Amino acid sequence: VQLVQSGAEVKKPGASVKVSCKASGYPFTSYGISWVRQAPGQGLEWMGWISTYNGNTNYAQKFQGRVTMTTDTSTTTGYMELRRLRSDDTAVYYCARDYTRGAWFGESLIGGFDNWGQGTLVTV
Amino acid sequence: STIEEQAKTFLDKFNHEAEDLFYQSSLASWNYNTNITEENVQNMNNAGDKWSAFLKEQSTLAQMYPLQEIQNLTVKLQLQALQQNGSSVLSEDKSKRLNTILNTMSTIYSTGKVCCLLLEPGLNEIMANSLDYNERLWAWESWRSEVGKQLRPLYEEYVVLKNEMARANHYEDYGDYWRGDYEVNGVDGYDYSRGQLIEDVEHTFEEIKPLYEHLHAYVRAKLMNAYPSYISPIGCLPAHLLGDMWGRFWTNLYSLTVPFGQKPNIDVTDAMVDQAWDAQRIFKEAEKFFVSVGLPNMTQGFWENSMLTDPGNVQKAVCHPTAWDLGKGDFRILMCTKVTMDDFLTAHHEMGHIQYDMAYAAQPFLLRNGANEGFHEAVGEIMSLSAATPKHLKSIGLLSPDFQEDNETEINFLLKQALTIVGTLPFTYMLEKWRWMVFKGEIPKDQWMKKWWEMKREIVGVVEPVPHDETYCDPASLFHVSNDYSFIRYYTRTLYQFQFQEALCQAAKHEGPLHKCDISNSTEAGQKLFNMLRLGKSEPWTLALENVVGAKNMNVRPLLNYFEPLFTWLKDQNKNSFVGWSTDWSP
Amino acid sequence: IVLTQSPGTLSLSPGERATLSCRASQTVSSTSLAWYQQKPGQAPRLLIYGASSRATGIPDRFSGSGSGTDFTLTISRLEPEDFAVYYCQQHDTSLTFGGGTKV
Amino acid sequence: LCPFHEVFNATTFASVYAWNRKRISNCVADYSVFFAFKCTNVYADSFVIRGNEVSQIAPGQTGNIADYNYKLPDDFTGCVIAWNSNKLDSKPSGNYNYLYRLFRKSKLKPFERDISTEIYQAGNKPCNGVAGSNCYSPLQSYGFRPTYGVGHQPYRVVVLSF
Ligand SMILES: *[C@@H]1O[C@H](CO[C@@H]2O[C@@H](C)[C@@H](O)[C@@H](O)[C@@H]2O)[C@@H](O)[C@H](O)[C@H]1NC(C)=O
Ligand SMILES: *[C@@H]1O[C@H](CO)[C@@H](O)[C@H](O)[C@H]1NC(C)=O
Ligand SMILES: *[C@@H]1O[C@H](CO)[C@@H](O)[C@H](O)[C@H]1NC(C)=O
Ligand SMILES: *[C@@H]1O[C@H](CO)[C@@H](O)[C@H](O)[C@H]1NC(C)=O
Ligand SMILES: *[C@@H]1O[C@H](CO)[C@@H](O)[C@H](O)[C@H]1NC(C)=O
Ligand SMILES: *[C@@H]1O[C@H](CO)[C@@H](O)[C@H](O)[C@H]1NC(C)=O
């Protein structure tokens, strides 16, 4: 299993950024996709989770109203869009395959984030 | 709609909750005993009080389900067990006074001292190993005075208040209350009146006595070498010279009466040490023994939750050997073993108690006990008789494979056993007989000590080292008398111990003397015993006994057979001495 | 909910035993706790899930355990390759990470 | 592919008195992946019971679970999967959120479920909902603890009914 993300981008405050995540090596619709942000010198901050089957989402409140997640099954690729970027949103954005919530039933599972991408650097 | 059906619903609920509140209490007690702290005491006391409450509330509720409306014994005996009022029949003033007296008498004994030394390890050490007439006598006449004179005025009340309690529960007196545990009714052909135990105990005692008379005469003749100026050849033995404070057992005198002192006894302590044994090995070997007869090893968590070794000097703990059952499949043994024969044999004993508690674990909460107050120590004691057998020790590699057991070895073995097992029966019998008379009210308060000494100097053949009057209450100087215990269980145990051993090892097809009749590598003997272990109290002890022994009562022939090779030997040793004693002789 | 880890900087010599602790502000189920390891310049990887189950491919020198509000990670022998940043995670409620500690 | 892993590896299982019935459909159904194991919709009934009660999850059986909680029909086709979950569902203080109905007016029909809490009247006189003499609540709680014996430890059971 591997995830392939996009390269670095530079944005200005108020702008939006779209980060892709191409997934392979597993059944796409059997596992969800999560996003985790890591600002320089900081730890990991959860942004949200999206189902690849139902399309159901679960976003961290702090990122509610700013983050929209979607998936494209036919290209087995996930996408995230972060709107109204602030100067404090400079960070590396990681894509991960989760085993923390079911993609079909939506209930919590025993596991964690199994496959992480490279991390996409967004400067603002 | 009827009482019996309502009783069933009530009991189903009484167990599915009394199981948990118990577990909590027992576990807290465990945690304290293995780790003595102030915090553990508070947790122990809190869980304890909660358990005691639940029982009081449930016992009261149970009173609305009269037994006259119940026909099923499974319900009747299970429910009856939960309808006993006990001390609750007394008014508040009498309940408080009785509890005050009981706690006071317990304290006086426990903190009693001669000053400056305490009973333990003080007076007991003197009585156990000091071979000096005058020093031993001082220890005796001191304990009897220092403690006996404190627990007399309280004991006069305890007797009266206890009878009032029992009478309000429809008993004649507290005597009937105690031995009500032996009562069997509602069963055709197995009925056993609580008033019958007296007749059966007296009967069995007289049959055994002839063995005691020869053992007594033998011991007396031999002690005269140590006490040539104190013991009369036709008289009673002085109480203070019996190897203990009360003379309950005739051990600690084995150094005074040795059949063949030129021969060594069986001792594998050195073998265990040389072979690098430890606590784990000792319990591991005991497990294999039980398995060899078809019993199910030790539970999966046994080896993880038990404390088989001394925890260290980091925390204070109790190392007194005991088997625990906390409920809900949680079985443990609490013991601090070392590499020695005493712990080797004890490990089998304590595991014998676990093998029982695992058998009746399927019983309803109130039925999870031994069929009687003897079917627990007996079902554990017969394990030590087997483990100690020299052919077992050879088989497990502790005795040399070429080791020979001759007739001199056999006599040394049997006598050591007789001093513990036979020489104790007249004491248990005599004490309970006295207590029963004093509760019934056959003996006036001012006449009891007179009757104590007179019945000892006729049943046991001992004597008053000095004249104790009425300000005294010697019988209260003993743990079981002052702490409200029934002592008869020590008589109605030994007799069962031999019945089971003989019946089971015969099933194992043993050919030879009973004292060599081991039960090992015999699944026939194993299953035979199991059949009465799984029953608990669900059936009459009379039936539980029939299932293995075939007897419905305390037949003592098995005991007499065990010591037969010693009895005949003693007869040929007493051929030139007096057998029996004169009650008119005094120190 | 908050997760706190300590010591912040557990820098120990190689070949020695190393332990990290994680404490929760509230009780969490053992079914929803995990540990992560992040090498310098690298994306983090799952080390342990379900409190004590090793993630596939993870060496047996890594052993997690714990319950309630007190969980730990033990490294039986600290290798040259184990000098990374460790994080504790919970998803008993929402999903959060601890601050992280450096070995 | 079917969400089988979402049934077996879930963080929490339901009570036996209120078992969770998950329907599996419109998927491949790969069955390629314990305490016990014996054998066009498939239903996965997920619940937690006591170890020594596992034997009641079978056709022809009776008992507190078979009669008053989860009745499995004698004419049953499917597999019963059980495993020990002592490390997950037990607490030192007692994990008392798992409940079962000790008593009921009548025994259950196959796959019948009743989650009412109506006071059970054992006697003939009414208690008006009060759990007093001869009235008892109909859902007690298992006090699961990590130190219980095997037969008293919690087991997670998934029944696959075809
Ligand atoms: C339950 O989970 C077991 C372990 O899963 C493994 O670790 C998790 C975190 C993921 O990375 C997963 O892809 C790995 O296989 C599985 O072995 C087991 O099959 C699962 N049970 C079912 C019914 O799927
Ligand atoms: C013994 O009890 C003390 C006080 O509660 C506690 O701190 C200590 O950890 C306990 N030791 C063990 C082995 O439980
Ligand atoms: C007594 O009740 C038990 C159930 O607790 C039952 O198994 C037994 O058969 C009943 N006894 C009789 C004689 O029906
Ligand atoms: C127990 O005490 C209760 C309440 O005083 C009384 O109703 C009942 O008859 C007593 N039963 C016995 C066996 O003494
Ligand atoms: C006891 O356990 C041993 C393994 O330690 C096994 O070989 C033996 O068959 C078991 N016996 C019983 C009675 O379960
Ligand atoms: C029991 O049988 C085993 C062989 O399985 C043997 O090694 C052992 O010595 C026997 N023990 C006794 C007391 O006969």
Author numbering:
A (entry chain H): 2 to 125
B (entry chain A): 19 to 133, 141 to 612
C (entry chain L): 2 to 104
D (entry chain E): 335 to 367, 374 to 379, 393 to 515
List sentences from the manuscript.
Currently circulating SARS-CoV-2 variants have acquired convergent mutations at hot spots in the receptor-binding domain1 (RBD) of the spike protein. Structures of the BQ.1.1, XBB.1 and BN. RBDs bound to the fragment antigen-binding region of the S309 antibody (the parent antibody for sotrovimab) and human ACE2 explain the preservation of antibody binding through conformational selection, altered ACE2 recognition and immune evasion.
XBB is a recombinant from BJ.1 and BM.1.1.1 (BA.2.75 sublineage) and addition of the G252V mutation in S yielded XBB.1, which has D339H, R346T, L368I, V445P, G446S, N460K, F486S, F490S and R493Q RBD substitutions relative to BA.2. To reveal how amino acid substitutions in the BQ.1.1 and XBB. RBDs alter receptor recognition and key antigenic sites, we determined cryo-electron microscopy (cryo-EM) structures for each RBD bound to the human ACE2 ectodomain and to the fragment antigen-binding (Fab) region of the S309 antibody. As V445P does not change the conformation of the ACE2-bound XBB. The structures demonstrate that S309 binds to both the BQ.1.1 and XBB. RBDs and reveal the molecular basis for the accommodation of the H339 residue in the XBB.1 epitope, involving extensive H339 side-chain interactions with S309 heavy chain complementarity-determining region 1 (CDRH1) and CDRH3.
